[PDB]
Design an enzyme around this catalytic site. Sequence first.
Site, short mmCIF file in Angstrom:
data_model
loop_
_atom_site.label_atom_id
_atom_site.label_comp_id
_atom_site.label_asym_id
_atom_site.label_seq_id
_atom_site.Cartn_x
_atom_site.Cartn_y
_atom_site.Cartn_z
N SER A 1 5.96 6.85 -1.99
CA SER A 1 5.93 8.11 -2.72
C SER A 1 6.02 9.34 -1.83
CB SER A 1 4.66 8.18 -3.58
OG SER A 1 4.69 7.18 -4.59
N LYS B 1 9.18 11.39 -2.37
CA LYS B 1 9.31 12.34 -3.46
C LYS B 1 9.59 13.75 -2.94
CE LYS B 1 6.72 9.81 -6.96
NZ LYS B 1 6.57 8.49 -6.27
N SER C 1 2.25 11.54 -8.73
CA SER C 1 3.15 10.58 -8.08
C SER C 1 3.81 9.67 -9.11
CB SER C 1 2.38 9.78 -7.03
OG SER C 1 3.27 9.22 -6.07
N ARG D 1 -6.94 7.63 3.06
CA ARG D 1 -5.78 8.34 3.58
C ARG D 1 -6.13 9.79 3.89
NH1 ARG D 1 -1.85 7.01 -1.31
NH2 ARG D 1 -3.77 7.76 -2.32
#
Length: 242
Positions: A47, A50, A95, A227
Amino acid sequence: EWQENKSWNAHFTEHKSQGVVVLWNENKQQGFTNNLKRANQAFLPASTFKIPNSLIALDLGVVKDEHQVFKWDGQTRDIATWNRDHNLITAMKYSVVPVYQEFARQIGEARMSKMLHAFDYGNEDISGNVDSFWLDGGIRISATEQISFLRKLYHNKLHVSERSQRIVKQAMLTEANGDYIIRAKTGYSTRIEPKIGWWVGWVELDDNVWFFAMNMDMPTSDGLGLRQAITKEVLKQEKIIP
Ligand SMILES: [Cl-]
């Protein structure tokens, strides 16, 4: 110039995982990472793709602006926030893969390939299905390659209009307060081993910008919050943010 700081490995080790954080000081033109090898190991962008996908869709007129509404196709998916209408802002925030799959199909193989070469984006290889190659196709990008791409974006140096880059940077807005602004995009790659999470973007300060790109092993979705949390510990340790 680059510098390896393995003391950051503790942030991954204390959470029973492994990964890399790459930082880039724009003012001083210095890079920093815990792991020079993994910083240059190429993974699926998932993602994080994107960002370029949005840029290309906007510059080709596939997307008119950040207000254009992409209606839900009526197919119930397992992510509740995907089962609703979206614009570019919310499609990035949540997302929303199905929205970006449709962008790519309308972009098409030829123009997508050309644009990724113009962006110097990763290995520039869209081999696979045009509507899923960033999830299980041949495209690959390293953390240091994310930095280079993001730095071009920050400076409006990518080979798309200034408007398209400004719109995508707005859609990347993640956090803002009196001390810093973060524009960033997460990624979660599961279809090809190793399964990883991404977080790439930058921290805007009054008089500097710190670009960052991290990936980490992600055997289950349970550790997705790491993350951002690991990245922020490194930023806090390096006194880039309070
Ligand atoms: Cl903004």
